[PDB]
C-alpha positions as a printed NumPy array, in Angstrom:
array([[  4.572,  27.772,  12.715],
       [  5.85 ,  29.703,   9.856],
       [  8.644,  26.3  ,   9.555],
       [  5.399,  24.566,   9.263],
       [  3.914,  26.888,   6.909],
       [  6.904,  26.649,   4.917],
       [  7.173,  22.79 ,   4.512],
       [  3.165,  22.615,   4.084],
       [  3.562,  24.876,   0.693],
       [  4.22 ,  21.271,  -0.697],
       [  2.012,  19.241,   1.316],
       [  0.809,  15.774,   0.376],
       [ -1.981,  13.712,   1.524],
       [ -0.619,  10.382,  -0.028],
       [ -3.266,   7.524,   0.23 ],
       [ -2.112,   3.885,   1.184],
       [ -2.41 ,   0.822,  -1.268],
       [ -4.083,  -1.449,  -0.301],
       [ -3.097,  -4.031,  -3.02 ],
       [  0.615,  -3.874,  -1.576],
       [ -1.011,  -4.645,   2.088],
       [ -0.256,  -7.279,   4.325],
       [ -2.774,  -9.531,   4.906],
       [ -2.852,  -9.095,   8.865],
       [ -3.442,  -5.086,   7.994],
       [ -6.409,  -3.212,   7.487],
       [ -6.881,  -0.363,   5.476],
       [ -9.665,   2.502,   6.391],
       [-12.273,   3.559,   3.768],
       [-10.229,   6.912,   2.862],
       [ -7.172,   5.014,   2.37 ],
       [ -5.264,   7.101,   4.7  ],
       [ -5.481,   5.258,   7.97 ],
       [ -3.583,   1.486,   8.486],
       [ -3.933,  -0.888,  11.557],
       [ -3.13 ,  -4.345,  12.291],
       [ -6.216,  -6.3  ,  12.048],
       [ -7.075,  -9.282,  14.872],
       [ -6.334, -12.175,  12.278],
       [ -4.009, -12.193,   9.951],
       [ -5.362, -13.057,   6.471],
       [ -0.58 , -11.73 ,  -3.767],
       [  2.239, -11.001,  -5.984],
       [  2.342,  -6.92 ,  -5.6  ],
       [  1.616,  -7.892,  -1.624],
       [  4.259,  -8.202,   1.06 ],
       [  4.35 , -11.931,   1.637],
       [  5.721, -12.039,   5.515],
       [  6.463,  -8.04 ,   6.672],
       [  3.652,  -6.139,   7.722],
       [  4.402,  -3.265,   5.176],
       [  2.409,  -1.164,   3.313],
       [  3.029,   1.676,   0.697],
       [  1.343,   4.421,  -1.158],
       [ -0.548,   4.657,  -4.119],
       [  1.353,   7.57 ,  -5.458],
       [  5.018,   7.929,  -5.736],
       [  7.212,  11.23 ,  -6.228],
       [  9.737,  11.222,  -8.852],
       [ 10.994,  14.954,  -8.944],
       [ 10.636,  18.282,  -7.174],
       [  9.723,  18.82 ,  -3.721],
       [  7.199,  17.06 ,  -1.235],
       [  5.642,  16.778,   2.518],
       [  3.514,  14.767,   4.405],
       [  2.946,  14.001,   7.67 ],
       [  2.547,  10.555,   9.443],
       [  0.918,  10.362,  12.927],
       [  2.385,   7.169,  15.082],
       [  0.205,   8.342,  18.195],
       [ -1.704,   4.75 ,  18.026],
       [  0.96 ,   3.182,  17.097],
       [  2.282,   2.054,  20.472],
       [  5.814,   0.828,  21.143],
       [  6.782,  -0.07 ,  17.616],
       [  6.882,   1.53 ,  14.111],
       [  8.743,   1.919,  10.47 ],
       [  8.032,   5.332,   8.787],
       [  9.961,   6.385,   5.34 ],
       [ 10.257,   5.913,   1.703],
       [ 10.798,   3.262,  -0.966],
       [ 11.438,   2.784,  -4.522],
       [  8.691,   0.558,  -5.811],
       [ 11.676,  -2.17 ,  -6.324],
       [ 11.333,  -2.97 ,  -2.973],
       [ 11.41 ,  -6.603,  -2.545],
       [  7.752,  -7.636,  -1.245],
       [  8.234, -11.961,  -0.506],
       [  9.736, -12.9  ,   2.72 ],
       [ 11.245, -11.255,   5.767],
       [ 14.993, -10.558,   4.258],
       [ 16.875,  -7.757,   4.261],
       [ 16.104,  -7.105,   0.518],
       [ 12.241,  -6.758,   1.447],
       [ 12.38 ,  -4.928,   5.208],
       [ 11.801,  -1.024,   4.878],
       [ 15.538,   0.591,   5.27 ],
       [ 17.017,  -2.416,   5.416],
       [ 18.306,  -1.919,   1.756],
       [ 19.362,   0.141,  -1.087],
       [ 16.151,   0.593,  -2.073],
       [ 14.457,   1.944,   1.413],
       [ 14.432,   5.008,   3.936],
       [ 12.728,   4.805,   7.404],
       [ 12.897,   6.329,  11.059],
       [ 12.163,   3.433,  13.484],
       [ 10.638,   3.265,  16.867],
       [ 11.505,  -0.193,  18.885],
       [ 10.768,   0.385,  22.513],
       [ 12.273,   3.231,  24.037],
       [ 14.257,   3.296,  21.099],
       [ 14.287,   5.373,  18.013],
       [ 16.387,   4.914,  14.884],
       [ 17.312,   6.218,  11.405],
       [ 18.184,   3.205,   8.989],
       [ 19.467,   2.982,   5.493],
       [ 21.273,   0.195,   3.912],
       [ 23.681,  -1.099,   6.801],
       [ 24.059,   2.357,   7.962],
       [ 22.111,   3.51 ,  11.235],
       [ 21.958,   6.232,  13.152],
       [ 20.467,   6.524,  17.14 ],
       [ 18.332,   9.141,  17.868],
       [ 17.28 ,  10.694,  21.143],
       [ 14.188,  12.83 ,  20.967],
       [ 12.606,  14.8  ,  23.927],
       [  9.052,  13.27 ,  24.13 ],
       [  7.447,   9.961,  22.468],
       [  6.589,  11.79 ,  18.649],
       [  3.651,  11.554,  18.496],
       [  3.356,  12.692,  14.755],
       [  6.509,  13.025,  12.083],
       [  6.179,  15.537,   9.323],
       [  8.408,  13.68 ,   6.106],
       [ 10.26 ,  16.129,   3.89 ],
       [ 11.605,  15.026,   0.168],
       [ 13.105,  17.158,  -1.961],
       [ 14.266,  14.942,  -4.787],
       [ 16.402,  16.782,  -6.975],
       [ 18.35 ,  17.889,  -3.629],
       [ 18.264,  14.601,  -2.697],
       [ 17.026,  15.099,   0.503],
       [ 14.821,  13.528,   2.923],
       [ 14.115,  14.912,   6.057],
       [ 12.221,  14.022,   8.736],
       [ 10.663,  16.099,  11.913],
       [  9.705,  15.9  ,  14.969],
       [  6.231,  17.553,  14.312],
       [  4.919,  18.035,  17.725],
       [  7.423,  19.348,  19.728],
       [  8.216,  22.302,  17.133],
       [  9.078,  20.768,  14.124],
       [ 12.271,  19.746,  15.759],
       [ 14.644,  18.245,  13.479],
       [ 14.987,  14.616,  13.676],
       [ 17.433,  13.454,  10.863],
       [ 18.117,  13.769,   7.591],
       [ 18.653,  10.994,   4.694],
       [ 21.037,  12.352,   2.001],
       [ 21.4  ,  10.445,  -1.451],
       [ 21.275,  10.596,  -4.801],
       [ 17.818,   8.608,  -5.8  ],
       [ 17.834,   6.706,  -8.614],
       [ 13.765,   6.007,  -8.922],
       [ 10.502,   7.431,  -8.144],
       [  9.85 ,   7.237,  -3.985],
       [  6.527,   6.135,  -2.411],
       [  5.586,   7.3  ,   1.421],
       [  6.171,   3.551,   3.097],
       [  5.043,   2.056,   6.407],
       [  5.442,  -0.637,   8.499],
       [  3.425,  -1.784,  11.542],
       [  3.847,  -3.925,  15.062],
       [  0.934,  -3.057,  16.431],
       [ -2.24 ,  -0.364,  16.471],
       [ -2.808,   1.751,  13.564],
       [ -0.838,   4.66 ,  11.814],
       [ -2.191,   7.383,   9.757],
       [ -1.515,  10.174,   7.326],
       [ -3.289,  13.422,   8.316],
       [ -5.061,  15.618,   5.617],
       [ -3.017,  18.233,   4.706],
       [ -4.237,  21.808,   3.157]])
């Protein structure tokens, strides 16, 4: 894929934090896969929302990674958040794209969704994705998401004008997502 090719001249490989965590979540030993543990169980860590971020964040310039939802099973939150993201309680303020603060694409179901801050947008791809390839580019402010099987089909595209530094952000309802190693 020379589209792949091009985004991967920027590729990340960001590994999760484990401090920001919910309890219920468990984090492999190379930090790069998260699943929902059988039993559930401070202050950095999301009190009530089954979130997660990364330990690096991107304040300029151009980025990609890639975030594989293929044991992820009928539910999922994949995007990007300013580290201002609330992390106590369930509220709008604290659930990824719910806010000012947060970008995600959204599987419930069937369903598939782009959110951001009372805006939302319905998409329709061909096939379950099976893995999303995230594009920022921050001074553009652009981010971009992709359908990465199926041909790095386009699947939407966040525009704003960001205002701090963005870290890769998940959140589960069941299995386990990871972030493939990229070159």
């Amino acid at each position: 894929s020379p589209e792949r090719s091009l985004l991967l001249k920027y590729a990340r490989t960001p590994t999760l934090d484990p401090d920001t965590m919910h309890a219920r979540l468990r984090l492999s030993a190379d930090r790069l896969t998260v699943r929902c543990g059988l039993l559930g169980s401070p202050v950095l860590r999301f009190d009530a929302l089954w979130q997660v971020l990364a330990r690096d964040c991107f304040a300029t310039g151009r980025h990609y990674w890639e975030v594989d939802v293929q044991e992820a099973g009928a539910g999922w939150w994949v995007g990007a958040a300013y580290a201002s993201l609330r992390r106590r309680g369930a509220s709008a303020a604290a659930r990824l794209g719910c806010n000012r603060q947060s970008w995600c694409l959204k599987r419930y179901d069937l369903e598939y969704w782009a959110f951001h801050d009372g805006q939302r947008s319905r998409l329709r791809p061909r096939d379950d994705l099976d893995r999303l390839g995230v594009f920022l580019d921050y001074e553009a402010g652009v981010l971009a998401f992709y359908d990465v099987t199926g041909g790095m089909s386009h699947l939407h595209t966040f525009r704003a004008t960001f205002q701090e530094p963005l870290y890769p952000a998940l959140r589960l309802w069941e299995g386990a997502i990871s972030i493939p190693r990229l070159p």
